[PDB]
Symmetry: D2
């Protein structure tokens, strides 16, 4: 069917992409990067994240596949050597689709902007000290003082979330996880410290205390927002769909990426 292929842009990924396109030419497959049904990412996790964001408005009509030519490649399912095997199996179809949860960030001013995240959404201050009130389903939970905050999807829990001390959570769990970056904790200022895991339909809201300017980074795209009144996090109703042709369990993916391989 309709497919497209994105490349990291080095020689290896570009040539692999040309060879897969040439192989797709022997099947009833049309190359279409406007309305693809299959999106192939050849590169690292950064390349995969770019592919997700390139098509985030057609998520329910698209199944993604990652081929890793990069370094780690956590979202990848294939090594370059199996590209010919992938072309053939994809050609037929009849694959299984697996869905992972996504995170919605809403930013309100004084106007709303919404963003979708596959890994995480973080917030830091523009220059001065970061201070926000943390409100959970409209109840004031804590005042946070420190470097910033990170809200992660389940599949994002192995990325920045992990380096901040968060728990790794299986992507079948519809949740988001809030982790702290370096908070002040003394006699006057206290935070919960621990990561927090929220289910679907819980809303986490960050309200400015003094400074209203923040740097909000969604999957490593960092944007300065001015005159912010509220940042709201919630599990998205939208999901990313993966094309799976063979069992590669999450916990094996975790083992291969962090323990040994």
């Amino acid at each position: 069917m309709k497919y497209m292929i994105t490349s990291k842009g080095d020689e290896k990924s570009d040539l692999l992409r040309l060879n897969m396109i040439a192989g797709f030419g022997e099947y009833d497959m049309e190359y279409d990067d406007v309305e693809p049904e299959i999106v192939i990412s050849i590169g690292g996790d950064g390349t995969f994240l770019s592919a997700f964001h390139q098509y985030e408005e057609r998520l329910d009509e698209i199944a993604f596949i990652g081929i890793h030519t990069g370094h780690l490649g956590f979202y990848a399912d294939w090594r370059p050597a199996e590209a010919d095997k992938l072309v053939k199996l994809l050609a037929k179809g009849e694959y299984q689709k697996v869905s992972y949860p996504l995170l919605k960030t809403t930013v309100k001013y004084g106007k709303e902007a919404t963003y979708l995240a596959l890994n995480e959404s973080t917030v830091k201050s523009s220059g001065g000290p970061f201070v926000v009130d943390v409100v959970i389903n409209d109840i004031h939970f804590e005042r946070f003082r420190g470097d910033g905050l990170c809200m992660s999807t389940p599949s994002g829990t192995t990325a920045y979330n992990k380096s901040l001390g968060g728990a790794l959570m299986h992507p079948s769990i519809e949740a988001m996880q809030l982790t702290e970056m370096a908070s002040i904790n003394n006699r006057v200022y206290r935070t919960i410290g621990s990561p927090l895991v929220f289910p679907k339909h819980h809303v986490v809201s960050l309200q400015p205390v003094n400074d209203k300017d923040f740097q909000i980074s969604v999957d490593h795209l960092s944007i300065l927002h001015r005159d912010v009144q509220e940042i709201r996090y919630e599990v998205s109703a939208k999901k990313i769909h993966f094309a799976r042709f063979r069992s590669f369990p999450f916990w094996r993916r975790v083992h291969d990426s962090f323990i040994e391989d």
Copy 2:
């Protein structure tokens, strides 16, 4: 209906219990500690955990209520001053029941023993070094060397799990969370480090490497098991039911217990 009341056993809790029983005497309420439908725990969280284990074979016929005369009282919903208000509201009934997930531990030898946990199930060695292989849905994930391991329910995530660095997770999430106690990490020995959160139907199995004797502690009842072949953790099919007469959200319960009150 049928109810019973357990007490921490100090003067304050004993007298409160006698006064609630006297007040229940003015309603169609029978005291029955064999087949109660309502179990009232007057004391701390330890007293509440004892009450849960006293009736863990009638969990689907029982709704629990905690009154805190202890110190922290995380599972408590009432202060002693409101005991008369509780008696009256309980008398009628028509309350809302809320359900929290539970954790099942199976211990196999060479014979099976199963245990149910409301807070957590932990494992340490009997004397020598603790070394187990960690197997997730039959796939070898890691070899753990260190002090021991802790598997927590969601409502347990605020207890020992929290002190071990685990994430606090809302009890509407059917999951269990595995945290490490002091693992060796050097050039030869490596663990994942991060807490792990498992959904329902995932099975975590600990397999001995050399020593087969372990100290297994379920909600702080520590038992020595000998000749252990396997310890298996999974989210229980059984749930604890709470009688709720007013909104007391989990995250407010967390705020009151850890931030301020």
Copy 3:
């Protein structure tokens, strides 16, 4: 003798400063903010840090005293109510001087800039990913990938260092402590993780791998450096001297600031 007084600049601190100056007028004390021998800081720790940096080129001729009108005031020894008692005791003199170690940062380009720190010196990237090689006394120790790094004095170990997981160390120890901010740790990238404590005469050098632009923050004064070839940390030969009129041990200062007061 010669003294000066700096103020946080709110009404409370300004009026306190005017009243201390009026009281100093009844003694053989000259106000001199060019060559003071005593520097009084009225305000928080930020005000005290500003005072230290205002006179960092006359450190061996100056004894500092902090009066806290701010919030925490970790470097403060006096409450505003005791200001009259301080004026009198300072008037005579015959006080004890206590010395704390300081941290030297050298930044080299392609030209050297040196900075002195009382709390800490940290380094982050200008925008892209932070990657440096960490070299200890000319031996390559690790490649660090993450948010950045923090090098703390002993008296700084209770500040940012503490929030990054570092150890609190008594200021009689001539050392510096290196802590990580959110490092990547997976199969390909590894750091030591743990804080590192270096004695006098050990030199820690950060060498860029790709990007050469860094944001270097010395006691919260953040400066962008371009075309950086090396950042070198070492315990300074210079020390800050405090005027002490009564025993206020470090560990009591720590207790009062973090446990209870």
Copy 4:
């Protein structure tokens, strides 16, 4: 001169020991395990710790050397292949001696017992909850509730201390480091959390609150003490001396053991 050799007791270490003894037979070296001047440990760190404790009453007349046939071997300086090179260089003498600090633990009852540690001294309860008051130079610092506490030497900071989150500190620093094992931190119970680093002559005292029975483990020799009134930690006046024949810096030792080799 006078020397002895201890072995891990496997074939490899036993045969290596016999071959070194045979080689020492061609020099003016006498085997004497009562009053040796050189103690050679062939095995892992556990074997080295046993050797240290076998001769802890002649520490100022003994220089130690470790040969690693074990797994990690942090205190080892030689691989088995260099044993012949070591015999020859030791034969002459004229080596450099390096000294590392040690930790003294005093246990008082109601009678004093003292112990010396090369890695660390830890304390846990005998069965019930561990609660002690922590007193620093006679000032009450905190009440600790949790699993236990660990006091580490500098060279011990890479062992259990590291797994508990402590800082790694260069052994030229005469200090000890106190780390927590899983403490309760909520609205009612609070600890400092952070590791604490103490200089020489500071005394840390643990005073029981209720239960007086503790399990005290010195370099992994765990002893039950009953009716304990006080546990006092301080940097020992005694030092362990190493024979060094070539530069092997601590931070390179750390790199080789934890980063790569």
